[PDB]
Amino acid sequence: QYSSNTQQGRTSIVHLFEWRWVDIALECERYLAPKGFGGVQVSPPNENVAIHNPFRPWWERYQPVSYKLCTRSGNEDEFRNMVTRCNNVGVRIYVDAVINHMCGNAVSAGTSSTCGSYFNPGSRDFPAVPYSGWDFNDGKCKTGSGDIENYNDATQVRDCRLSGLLDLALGKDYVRSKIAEYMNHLIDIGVAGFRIDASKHMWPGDIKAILDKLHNLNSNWFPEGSKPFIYQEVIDLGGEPIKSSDYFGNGRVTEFKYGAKLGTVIRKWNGEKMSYLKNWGEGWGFMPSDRALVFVDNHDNQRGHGAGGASILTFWDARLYKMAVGFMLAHPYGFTRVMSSYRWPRYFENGKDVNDWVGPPNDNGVTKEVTINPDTTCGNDWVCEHRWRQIRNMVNFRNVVDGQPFTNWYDNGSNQVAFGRGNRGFIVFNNDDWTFSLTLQTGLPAGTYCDVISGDKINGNCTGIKIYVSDDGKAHFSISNSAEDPFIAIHAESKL
């Protein structure tokens, strides 16, 4: 469950948040694959509730109605097509498994669901699964409201409803089998792994129990004995009885400390600065590197009230986003995931985004297709950070320097750093307010390297900055505190 199952060098997976299958299919073939991306974190592919108030939320997909692969992204047919096509290009698909609950109990009974299955939350009836009264933890939960009231009572966290969300009774085999059936169905199609949603609200043991019921990856794209890659969403920044570690037995864990801290350091808040990043990794109190799944921002927290808080850097602050993402990708710690969002009428009001609920760009609740522009950017309001050059090349930079150790770190006791990955890469940062000039030991073979940030190496030449390295490995760098991008990166493949 620890192996990504990616294909050939590929070190990172992108989350094409709320995208439609037909669009990820294409995206895979036309970009993802040729641009070295490992895989795609898809949105909950199961039939969910249709929330009309507010209008079609970004979170209605985390409120299950059945396990029919039939969401706003498409139907099973379209879904299979995507996996098949993406797999044919070495781009893995990772399904967002929503398995601790169904929809909110308050929700009105009816057919208001992405696939039209009937369902009555008040009576606990989900005929399309099927689930019923005794398949939910109603009895088991010890709280007065039946809701999670105190995150200090590890037990009520897993046995009670998260925000009123009907908590499936995962202790029962009927339920574990129904879920395993769902996840196995996916696997048979060609899935490479999952993102176990709300892992904190599930007993590690239950998650294991369920995982153990899984088949092996489809012999048609994976080797014999391939195990579904498993990363579980657990938000643990201390202060709670439940610890990320509690889940290492099932697979990787989402390290939310990573993105939080990094952002705090890039934003230069709380006296933090980049020179303090010498021992970035387990050194800053982060879960063991090969049990971690990192990212700067994830779909949820990029909206402000996630784990990190206002400190989380998102696409909105591009100049600093690109940097934090660049640093992350360049550093060896954890397994990386890059975000790819969509734009929305962000309107802050005393502390909150009154619109952080807004769903994907659409036309009367119908998700807009992702259109590509001659300059490789997207249309219809899809941000497409994964297509940005500064990130894209760094997504590749990671690939190129894979396996190489962290070294040749330099700092100016401020915000001007730089470090390399063995002899295949080097990256230099300047988050200070004064031009950065100095000759650094790049630990790279002599030659002329193209900065894959300001440009690329095309037809034997750089389109951006050129860096000159000499036998002794040294090279001079110059990054103005107001440069387009205050950081430069070079690697074995960007050498002329």
298 contact choice in Ca ion, Cl ion, a copy of itself, none (CB below 5 to 8 Å, kind-dependent): Cl ion
Closest contact distance (angstroms) between CB of 285 and a copy of itself is 4
| C-alpha distance from residue 154 to each of 160, 242, 307 (Å) | 10, 6, 18
Using CB under 5 A as the binding rule, the residues of this chain from 215 to 234 that contact Cl ion are: 233
Rounded distance, CA 393 to CA 399, Å? 10
Q: Does 199 bind Ca ion (CB under 5 A)?
A: no
Cβ-Cβ contacts under 8 Å for 67 (sequence gap 6 or more): 46, 47, 128, 129, 178, 181, 182, 185
Amino acid residing at 453 = I
383, 315 contact by CB (below 8 A)? yes
| DSSP state for residue 405 in the 8-state scheme | P
410, 418 contact by CB (below 8 A)? yes
Using CB under 5 A as the binding rule, the residues of this chain from 72 to 111 that contact Ca ion are: 100
Closest contact distance (angstroms) between CB of 229 and a copy of itself is 27
340 contact choice in Cl ion, a copy of itself, Ca ion, none (CB below 5 to 8 Å, kind-dependent): none
Is residue 331 a known part of a binding site? no
Catalytic residues: 197, 233
288, 272 contact by CB (below 8 A)? no
Q: Does 156 bind Ca ion (CB under 5 A)?
A: no
456 contact choice in Ca ion, a copy of itself, Cl ion, none (CB below 5 to 8 Å, kind-dependent): none
Q: Does 387 bind Ca ion (CB under 5 A)?
A: no
Is residue 201 a known part of a binding site? yes
Residue 125 or 147 with smaller CB distance to a copy of itself: 147
Residue 15 or 201 with smaller CB distance to Ca ion: 201
Going by C-alpha positions, the residue among 324, 338, 325 that lies closest to residue 40 is 338
Rounded distance, CA 38 to CA 12, Å? 5
Residue 161 or 387 with smaller CB distance to Ca ion: 161
295, 14 contact by CB (below 8 A)? no
Going by C-alpha positions, the residue among 82, 76, 99, 102 that lies closest to residue 41 is 82
Residue 174 or 348 with smaller CB distance to a copy of itself: 348
61, 201, 261, 299: which one contacts Ca ion (CB under 5 A)?
A: 201
The sign of the CA dihedral 124, 126, 132, 135 is negative
Q: Does 298 bind Cl ion (CB under 5 A)?
A: yes
Closest contact distance (angstroms) between CB of 303 and a copy of itself is 12
Closest contact distance (angstroms) between CB of 307 and Ca ion is 19
Amino acid residing at 386 = H
Rounded distance, CA 208 to CA 179, Å? 12
201 contact choice in Cl ion, Ca ion, a copy of itself, none (CB below 5 to 8 Å, kind-dependent): Ca ion
Is residue 389 a known part of a binding site? no
Q: Does 158 bind Ca ion (CB under 5 A)?
A: yes
For the annotated binding site, the residues are 100, 158, 167, 195, 201, 298, 337
The binding site for Cl ion (CB under 5 A) comprises: 233, 254, 298
